[PDB]
Design an enzyme around this catalytic site. Structure first.
Site, PDB file in Angstrom:
ATOM      1  N   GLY A  70      -7.218  -1.830  21.591  1.00 33.17           N
ATOM      2  CA  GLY A  70      -8.207  -2.120  20.578  1.00 33.17           C
ATOM      3  C   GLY A  70      -7.708  -2.933  19.408  1.00 33.17           C
ATOM      4  N   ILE A  99      -7.450  -0.972  12.660  1.00 34.90           N
ATOM      5  CA  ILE A  99      -6.786   0.321  12.536  1.00 34.90           C
ATOM      6  C   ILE A  99      -5.739   0.456  13.645  1.00 34.90           C
ATOM      7  CG2 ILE A  99      -7.052   2.829  12.573  1.00 34.90           C
ATOM      8  CD1 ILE A  99      -9.858   2.515  11.463  1.00 34.90           C
ATOM      9  N   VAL A 154     -12.263  -2.358  29.425  1.00 35.71           N
ATOM     10  CA  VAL A 154     -12.492  -0.978  29.817  1.00 35.71           C
ATOM     11  C   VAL A 154     -13.857  -0.720  30.473  1.00 35.71           C
ATOM     12  CG1 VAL A 154     -10.873  -0.053  28.123  1.00 35.71           C
ATOM     13  CG2 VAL A 154     -13.296  -0.373  27.485  1.00 35.71           C
ATOM     14  N   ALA A 189     -21.064  -1.672  19.329  1.00 37.12           N
ATOM     15  CA  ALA A 189     -22.506  -1.528  19.420  1.00 37.12           C
ATOM     16  C   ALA A 189     -23.148  -2.836  18.983  1.00 37.12           C
ATOM     17  CB  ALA A 189     -22.989  -0.372  18.561  1.00 37.12           C
ATOM     18  N   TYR A 241     -25.176   3.898  10.418  1.00 34.30           N
ATOM     19  CA  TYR A 241     -24.235   4.124  11.509  1.00 34.30           C
ATOM     20  C   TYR A 241     -25.012   4.276  12.818  1.00 34.30           C
ATOM     21  CZ  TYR A 241     -19.574   5.148  13.204  1.00 34.30           C
ATOM     22  OH  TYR A 241     -18.372   5.111  13.853  1.00 34.30           O
ATOM     23  N   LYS A 281     -20.144   8.235  18.766  1.00 29.79           N
ATOM     24  CA  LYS A 281     -18.992   8.998  18.279  1.00 29.79           C
ATOM     25  C   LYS A 281     -19.167  10.494  18.542  1.00 29.79           C
ATOM     26  CE  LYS A 281     -16.411   5.622  16.731  1.00 29.79           C
ATOM     27  NZ  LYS A 281     -15.096   5.230  17.342  1.00 29.79           N
TER      28      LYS A 281
HETATM   29  N1  LIG Z   1     -13.805   0.570  10.816  1.00 29.02           N
HETATM   30  C1  LIG Z   1     -13.862   1.790  10.283  1.00 29.02           C
HETATM   31  O1  LIG Z   1     -14.059   1.984   9.070  1.00 29.02           O
HETATM   32  C2  LIG Z   1     -13.655   2.961  11.198  1.00 29.02           C
HETATM   33  C3  LIG Z   1     -13.678   4.272  10.726  1.00 29.02           C
HETATM   34  C4  LIG Z   1     -13.427   5.322  11.590  1.00 29.02           C
HETATM   35  C5  LIG Z   1     -13.161   5.058  12.916  1.00 29.02           C
HETATM   36  N2  LIG Z   1     -13.159   3.784  13.356  1.00 29.02           N
HETATM   37  C6  LIG Z   1     -12.860   3.445  14.826  1.00 29.02           C
HETATM   38  O2  LIG Z   1     -11.602   2.830  14.897  1.00 29.02           O
HETATM   39  C7  LIG Z   1     -11.558   2.017  16.097  1.00 29.02           C
HETATM   40  C8  LIG Z   1     -11.029   0.639  15.773  1.00 29.02           C
HETATM   41  O3  LIG Z   1     -11.997  -0.096  14.994  1.00 29.02           O
HETATM   42  P1  LIG Z   1     -11.583  -1.035  13.770  1.00 29.02           P
HETATM   43  O4  LIG Z   1     -12.353  -0.563  12.593  1.00 29.02           O
HETATM   44  O5  LIG Z   1     -10.108  -1.123  13.663  1.00 29.02           O
HETATM   45  O6  LIG Z   1     -12.152  -2.448  14.273  1.00 29.02           O
HETATM   46  P2  LIG Z   1     -11.747  -3.470  15.432  1.00 29.02           P
HETATM   47  O7  LIG Z   1     -12.773  -4.533  15.601  1.00 29.02           O
HETATM   48  O8  LIG Z   1     -10.448  -4.134  14.929  1.00 29.02           O
HETATM   49  O9  LIG Z   1     -11.466  -2.646  16.874  1.00 29.02           O
HETATM   50  C9  LIG Z   1     -12.435  -2.416  17.938  1.00 29.02           C
HETATM   51  C10 LIG Z   1     -11.791  -2.863  19.226  1.00 29.02           C
HETATM   52  O10 LIG Z   1     -12.621  -2.600  20.382  1.00 29.02           O
HETATM   53  C11 LIG Z   1     -12.137  -3.468  21.391  1.00 29.02           C
HETATM   54  N3  LIG Z   1     -13.064  -3.535  22.518  1.00 29.02           N
HETATM   55  C12 LIG Z   1     -14.410  -3.793  22.467  1.00 29.02           C
HETATM   56  N4  LIG Z   1     -14.976  -3.923  23.643  1.00 29.02           N
HETATM   57  C13 LIG Z   1     -13.931  -3.724  24.535  1.00 29.02           C
HETATM   58  C14 LIG Z   1     -13.870  -3.739  25.944  1.00 29.02           C
HETATM   59  N5  LIG Z   1     -14.933  -3.962  26.733  1.00 29.02           N
HETATM   60  N6  LIG Z   1     -12.665  -3.522  26.526  1.00 29.02           N
HETATM   61  C15 LIG Z   1     -11.604  -3.304  25.742  1.00 29.02           C
HETATM   62  N7  LIG Z   1     -11.539  -3.260  24.404  1.00 29.02           N
HETATM   63  C16 LIG Z   1     -12.747  -3.481  23.857  1.00 29.02           C
HETATM   64  C17 LIG Z   1     -11.942  -4.802  20.675  1.00 29.02           C
HETATM   65  O11 LIG Z   1     -10.991  -5.603  21.368  1.00 29.02           O
HETATM   66  C18 LIG Z   1     -11.445  -4.363  19.294  1.00 29.02           C
HETATM   67  O12 LIG Z   1     -10.042  -4.561  19.184  1.00 29.02           O
HETATM   68  C19 LIG Z   1     -12.970   2.062  16.687  1.00 29.02           C
HETATM   69  O13 LIG Z   1     -13.001   3.073  17.688  1.00 29.02           O
HETATM   70  C20 LIG Z   1     -13.820   2.464  15.478  1.00 29.02           C
HETATM   71  O14 LIG Z   1     -15.034   3.105  15.834  1.00 29.02           O
HETATM   72  C21 LIG Z   1     -13.400   2.743  12.539  1.00 29.02           C
END
Ligand SMILES: NC(=O)c1ccc[n+]([C@@H]2O[C@H](COP(=O)([O-])OP(=O)(O)OC[C@H]3O[C@@H](n4cnc5c(N)ncnc54)[C@H](O)[C@@H]3O)[C@@H](O)[C@H]2O)c1
Ligand SMILES: NC(=O)c1ccc[n+]([C@@H]2O[C@H](COP(=O)([O-])OP(=O)(O)OC[C@H]3O[C@@H](n4cnc5c(N)ncnc54)[C@H](O)[C@@H]3O)[C@@H](O)[C@H]2O)c1
Ligand SMILES: NC(=O)c1ccc[n+]([C@@H]2O[C@H](COP(=O)([O-])OP(=O)(O)OC[C@H]3O[C@@H](n4cnc5c(N)ncnc54)[C@H](O)[C@@H]3O)[C@@H](O)[C@H]2O)c1
Ligand SMILES: NC(=O)c1ccc[n+]([C@@H]2O[C@H](COP(=O)([O-])OP(=O)(O)OC[C@H]3O[C@@H](n4cnc5c(N)ncnc54)[C@H](O)[C@@H]3O)[C@@H](O)[C@H]2O)c1
Lengths: 250, 249, 250, 250
Positions: D13, D20, D67, D97, D157, D164
């Site tokens: 990811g 993150i 995935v 989403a 959200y 989630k």
């Molecule tokens: N952004 C926030 O404030 C926050 C808060 C809590 C939790 N999260 C969670 O943290 C995680 C990382 O998000 P982020 O905020 O770092 O943003 P981000 O955009 O950097 O990461 C999301 C990732 O999903 C991957 N992805 C999407 N479709 C895919 C697929 N078909 N196959 C493989 N990989 C795929 C993308 O390559 C991307 O790197 C997510 O699960 C998000 O829900 C985010």
């Protein structure tokens, strides 16, 4: 093994070698921490001192601290202030309820036993936190121990279950107060530990828990190391279950 | 209009017409129930008698019951046993904490204030349930009232938040004890009721799903359900009557 | 017995006489409600029509409604709107998961099975709510059914557990959306009902549930009556356990 | 800085510097771990490879892994097995989403958008875990990321809140499958982070959160270090809030 180097923690509630507080003390020591111990009454003085002496390095402060005694609690933390100036956290591992209350049905809990359990097992976190913030001038973590019985009904846990609920809510309200002063407040919810019909419960955990084993003092102590370290600087008001996964079961 | 026909309940914690216990009593009465009232001290006796007489009769049973007083508590339910024999439930609407503890930060809560809040607001449910099961020979429901502050941190609720947490845990352990005797134990978590507080009400109006604050009548009508046979499968439950506010993050 | 007088509800998910939906239908009827029934497919039309027929008072409308099909869902509620005008709520009693998914370990759940379970058991509440808000012009309540397995791990519930978690979260998000339109959204979490090894599950409940008995359809039905009535007008986004108190146990 | 010495983790990811997942990768690296990366789009191939390249003390293994594609997911982890033999955990940081679903009311969520969000954000943890257990022969931890919006209603959200919720339930059911194989499964619930009307959200956290500040990628990564380490060996099925305490507020 250097997460807590240069840091000093007060560990309250060591009674013997099987105490969770002693698991926590050993983990903290292995992570490079300096430790201060308190002990409940004179009957425990020798045990705590003997255990504290088994720690390599500087010999540890070992002070009496009855957490139902406001004068002694204050004197104890004044002494700590005068001996070390600044501490970086406190491990609150203190609980009590009368055996009679735990033996009966919950509805038959005596008024005095209810208030005793609340005073010793729940209010003491707050009483300790109030003194602790006087010497935690660089922030840090306050840790308490709880059990699943504070969240859902566990057989025979009765009045202690209600005191742990009180304890867990206190963790949240204390976290909300002390965060602005750099102080985090967290709980560990430990699973039953073999050392500490108790055996059928242990068997049931070995059988049904996700990790298929019961908890150890060292597992709790190592989670305590995380909560006391800078690794957990974003974590407060939290209750981490160290219970081989049992808490997820319906 | 008849869900509680032929049933008798004890209502505890009436102090005046703005007491949520009074809102509950009205709903219960409207659903056909006979009511027994208790009063904390002599200072409240006239209020409770008068309010009771407007619902039941000059003949209504109004009894002293300081829940910190074990002999008066026992004597109360002994009187109830002698006068009516069987009751079908209790509405526990009793809470107290010192203003001083509620004004300061939670970490500065006094030990005496904490134990007082625990004794009156949490242990009293258990002390009352212990007596009530002696006269609830046909089973029934014990109800208590709580607030979101017992689950999550609410500003200025402090010591009362921790007491409500004790109370809600007590609800569960009591449910587990008393279910085998046909006695259910449940809570209602009420949202703030109009009847700085005004800004709180305004935030609820703005943010709660139903976009309005809670009324005593909404709480009373949920109590009617919990006391009725409609809820015979419900125990150890905490029902939020708070315009949905509890779901918000 | 007249709580729901002057009110009309759609009941979805009747399959036969022991469907929880039919138990709910009987309670609603007994409380004075008029009912509209949907049937999932042609093979169920006769069962549903015959059950609807056993309800004294005016004729019940019985309509096709496959909740996996948007065209059919729209057409169903269009018919309802035109033929009855206003309704006051919907009992959503619909779930499905593949038997092979339910029998394996959760980690081996098929992707198609997971998505199908989510579609039918969770998204369908939202699809129904979107159509129902058009005809609930004076507000009311939307009800769905869930189970403890959506909150905590229950053996052999697996993919349905995760679908019920989506469902319960959907209840909250729908309640937040629809409340301003006077529409409440709630769940009942039912315990197992008599009518792998299912009877031992039943015996464990009888032994360990606070009320020492299993749940009946009629208990669920009577809690539905409360949630659909004006007595519950302050209650939304809630999940009421009708499970003999089993949910409190640790 | 040797908590994870000798250990290898797959990080899924990473999209860019602010992800993150890249905060988690930096912390694991600082704790002594070697890292393997996957990338989704060939449009992300460049970003992930540049970031992985800056990790001193190791070469890059950077593999395409969609995935939603079961053939490729299986091939990816077979390649991982052949290249390093044993991995000691996976960081699952994958969510998606449609924007139109996230802006509209939750009740207007499209069926295909809902299922897409479930497939990518929730089921992917299971599909990944099923492959990961083939290579985690010495046990270890599978981590995923979630958000308070999966537990309670957060503005806008919407469909991701329900995904989630589905993810958090999957964490529990997977923990209870995989624990017997020495594999733990846990989540971190991260608060809003400045780098990822967003500013008023951040401002309100700074005002109301116990620690009076928003979260950092580094705070999350350091909690990840704990959960992947032997210190967390008694912890599974857990959700640790790394959110400055915000989760405790009513
Ligand atoms: N952004 C926030 O404030 C926050 C808060 C809590 C939790 N999260 C969670 O943290 C995680 C990382 O998000 P982020 O905020 O770092 O943003 P981000 O955009 O950097 O990461 C999301 C990732 O999903 C991957 N992805 C999407 N479709 C895919 C697929 N078909 N196959 C493989 N990989 C795929 C993308 O390559 C991307 O790197 C997510 O699960 C998000 O829900 C985010
Ligand atoms: N044992 C378990 O399985 C378990 C599980 C979960 C949580 N816990 C919690 O862990 C903590 C430690 O208990 P333990 O199991 O290690 O047993 P323990 O007997 O070793 O520790 C309890 C301590 O409380 C101290 N204490 C009692 N009254 C006191 C007073 N007036 N003033 C000061 N200290 C006082 C005792 O001196 C003792 O050291 C408790 O809070 C307990 O509830 C225990
Ligand atoms: N006020 C709110 O917004 C709110 C919200 C949720 C729940 N509740 C709960 O509702 C209940 C009633 O509060 P209220 O708002 O109606 O106000 P209130 O002041 O009218 O009720 C509290 C009652 O406690 C009784 N009481 C106090 N000490 C007692 C003692 N020693 N023995 C016996 N009775 C004693 C008093 O007689 C009084 O009637 C409490 O349990 C409270 O926590 C209130
Ligand atoms: N059975 C239990 O012990 C239990 C416990 C708690 C909650 N619940 C829930 O109660 C609800 C009712 O189930 P039940 O136990 O009464 O059994 P049931 O089989 O009688 O009801 C489920 C219904 O889903 C309908 N359905 C399936 N696919 C559909 C589709 N594509 N379109 C429309 N309808 C479709 C079927 O027609 C069926 O009537 C379910 O949501 C279930 O999860 C059941």
């Amino acid at each position: 093994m250097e997460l807590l180097q240069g840091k000093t923690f007060v560990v309250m509630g060591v009674a013997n070698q099987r105490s969770i507080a002693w698991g926590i003390a050993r983990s903290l020591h292995n992570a490079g921490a300096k430790l201060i111990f308190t002990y409940a009454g004179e009957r425990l003085e020798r045990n705590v001192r003997e255990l504290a002496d088994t720690l390599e390095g500087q010999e540890s402060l070992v002070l009496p601290c009855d957490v139902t005694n406001d004068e002694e609690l204050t004197a104890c933390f004044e002494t700590i202030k005068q001996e070390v100036g600044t501490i970086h956290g406190v491990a609150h591992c203190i609980a009590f309820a009368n055996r009679d209350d735990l033996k009966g049905e919950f509805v038959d809990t005596s008024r005095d036993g209810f208030l005793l359990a609340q005073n010793i097992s729940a209010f003491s976190l707050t009483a300790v936190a109030r003194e602790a913030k006087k010497v935690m001038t660089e922030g840090g973590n306050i840790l308490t121990l709880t059990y699943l019985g504070g969240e859902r009904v566990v057989k025979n846990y009765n009045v202690m279950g209600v005191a742990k609920a009180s304890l867990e809510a206190s963790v949240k309200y204390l976290a909300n107060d002390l965060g602005q002063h750099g102080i985090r407040v967290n709980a560990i919810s430990a699973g039953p530990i073999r050392t500490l019909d108790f055996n059928s419960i242990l068997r049931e955990i070995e059988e049904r828990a996700p990790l298929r084993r019961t908890t150890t003092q060292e597992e709790v102590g190592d989670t305590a190391v995380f909560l006391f370290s800078d690794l957990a600087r974003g974590v407060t008001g939290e209750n981490i279950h160290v219970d081989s996964g049992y808490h997820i079961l319906g």
